[PDB]
């Protein structure tokens, strides 16, 4: 086998976080199990998660992983036979610009929900007498939009706490930035400290290549004999679902066509509307794969 075939490198599996945002929620907010909407697979931020806004471009966002390790030594062996990772500490830091309520609450470790602006809008945010140990829920979601098929890659940290705060320098040519480091703790209710996830049409394209599940080889369709009504009513339209052999819905990816638009007119999303009584053929194609269904239309 040649070197290129042995390497089998794919450039499409390189995901660049072209855009990125961090969302913080109070610890009472229900944690985000996943960011993919169960309806159409779009991005679904759970309620209670508020974005922190812009942050510094040059600083980026650094995810730090720290391993505590212990070498096990054998009497009859010179080198360590094994090593044990006692713990993996995850932190992340970024330099955020905006001066909003949640940003300032995170910076000062105080709840400013009871802060009432003065008659002319002025506010004063006193630091707590004793620093307060407050936990939040963090979502770090980034978008790589390629060919109008975005990939949303995200980190879910159900429990984060301000670990340190970098010194801030005031310069008459730069805006004020707050650069916190947030350490992730393991949440008992969800059973993890940090999780990584992928979603989007681009990720749906790349699941098989990445190697999760099985490769898409058979394009099955919803039951191929749906009955539709010409007259307006409950049964004047019928929705078709296009699935792969690996249990992935490929309806947005496939192309819906009708060989007989007179009988059932098919939309892009996969809705056949009864127009004239008879039988129609609906075909959804994706590359070489295709699926067909014979729709019955009644007046």
């Amino acid at each position: 086998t040649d070197f290129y075939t042995i390497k089998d490198a794919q450039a499409d599996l390189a995901i660049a976080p072209l855009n990125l945002t961090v969302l913080l929620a109070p610890y009472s907010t229900t944690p985000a199990t996943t960011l993919e909407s169960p309806t159409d697979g779009s991005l679904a931020i759970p309620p209670g998660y508020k974005s922190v806004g812009h942050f510094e471009k040059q600083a980026g966002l650094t995810l730090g992983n720290e391993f505590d390790s212990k070498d096990i030594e054998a009497y009859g062996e010179p080198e360590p036979i094994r090593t044990i990772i006692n713990k993996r500490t995850t932190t992340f830091d970024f330099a955020m610009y905006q001066n909003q309520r949640n940003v300032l609450e995170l910076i000062w470790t105080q709840d400013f929900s009871n802060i009432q602006p003065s008659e002319f809008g002025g506010i004063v945010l006193e630091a707590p007498k004793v620093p307060k140990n407050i936990y939040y829920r963090a979502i770090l979601v980034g978008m790589d939009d390629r060919n109008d098929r975005p990939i949303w890659l995200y980190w879910l940290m159900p429990k984060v706490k301000l670990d340190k705060l970098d010194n801030q320098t005031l310069n008459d040519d730069n805006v004020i930035e707050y650069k916190p480091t947030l350490k992730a703790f393991r949440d008992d209710v969800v059973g993890y400290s940090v999780a990584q996830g992928f979603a989007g049409p681009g990720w749906r394209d790349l699941v098989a290549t990445a190697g999760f599940g099985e490769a898409l080889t058979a394009l099955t369709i919803t039951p191929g004999s749906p009955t539709v009504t010409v007259a307006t009513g409950a049964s004047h339209t019928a929705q078709l679902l296009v699935e792969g052999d690996n249990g992935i819905n490929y309806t947005p990816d496939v192309v819906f066509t009708s060989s007989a638009p007179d009988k059932a007119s098919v939309s892009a999303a996969g809705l056949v509307t009864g127009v004239a009584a008879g039988s129609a053929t609906i075909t959804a194609t994706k590359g070489a794969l295709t699926a067909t269904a014979t729709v019955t239309v009644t007046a």
Partner: protein, 290 residues
């Protein structure tokens, strides 16, 4: 390494490879820094003299071996099984074997739990399923042992004599054991081998001692080691009680050997004799001594 193998055979007969080829197959390996394991602890005695202190003798001491093992497995349930089995392989009242195998052969040391084991790390052991157990074991008999060399001589004659080749190839004196059938008057050798412990090394060069006349069914075991009564009869008779305050006095000193003579008289049936020479060593491995 492949030059050294360490095994444990527990009180329950379980087999563990702590070090060497096949180590850790049962889940337990041996950690470094094991102490009082190689040389038998000996203390020397000194008495005041004109030039300081004069040599007064030596006494061997029991072994206090403190060693750590590591019990490991992928899943905590199986690790718990492994740890329970390792704990079951030990006791305070009864000893378990610890075998060292090298190019010099296999030598074993019988060890028992001197105190409670110290298991696990600071956190609970199910987190890692890979935990150290510190064992403080003790060897009441501090010498390393090989399987003893045994010889048998049978005779149908009323009166007979035999010679047993005997040689101590170890570095410590060993105490002979005899098993003599009955009836019959036996004469056993108690050669000094030049040992001047009683100031009779040359006088007792060819010392022989007669056992009391054994009656029918009174087969005896004559163990010269001091941990054990010398004469013990099979049928429970008090043979040493009959034997008039005599004793076997001398061990087979290192580097010494001869054809020791055994005499049998007044044995109408004709009797049998068995000689057991122990093989004690002060180190788990050592080249043969001459």
């Amino acid at each position: 390494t492949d030059f050294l193998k360490i095994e444990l055979i527990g009180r329950d007969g379980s087999h563990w490879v702590l070090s060497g080829p096949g180590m850790g197959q049962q889940g337990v390996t041996l950690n470094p820094n094991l102490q009082q394991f190689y040389d038998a602890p000996v203390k020397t005695l000194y008495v005041p003299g004109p030039f300081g202190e004069e040599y007064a003798g030596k006494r061997v001491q029991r072994r206090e071996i403190v060693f750590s093992v590591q019990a490991y497995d992928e899943d905590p349930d199986t690790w718990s099984t492994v740890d329970s089995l390792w704990r079951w392989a030990w006791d305070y009242d009864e000893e378990s074997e610890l075998r060292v195998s090298t190019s010099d052969g296999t030598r074993f040391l019988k060890v028992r739990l001197m105190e409670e084991p110290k298991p696990y790390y600071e956190k609970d052991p199910h987190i890692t399923a890979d935990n150290p157990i510190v064992m403080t074991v003790t060897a009441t008999f501090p010498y390393w042992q090989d399987e003893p060399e045994e010889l048998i001589w049978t005779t149908l004659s009323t009166e007979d004599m035999t010679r047993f080749p005997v040689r101590n190839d170890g570095d410590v004196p060993v105490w002979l054991k005899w098993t003599l059938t009955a009836p019959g008057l036996w004469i056993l050798p108690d050669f000094s081998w030049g040992n001047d412990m009683y100031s009779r090394g040359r006088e007792d060069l060819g010392r022989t001692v007669a056992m009391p006349e054994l009656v029918a069914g009174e087969h005896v075991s004559v163990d010269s080691d001091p941990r054990v009564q010398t004469l013990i009869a099979v049928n429970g008779m008090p043979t040493q009680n009959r034997w008039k305050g005599n004793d076997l006095l001398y061990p087979l000193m290192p580097g010494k050997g001869a054809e020791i003579p055994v005499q049998l008289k007044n044995a109408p049936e004709g009797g049998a004799c068995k000689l057991t020479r122990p093989r004690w060593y002060s180190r788990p491995w050592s080249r043969p001594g001459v």
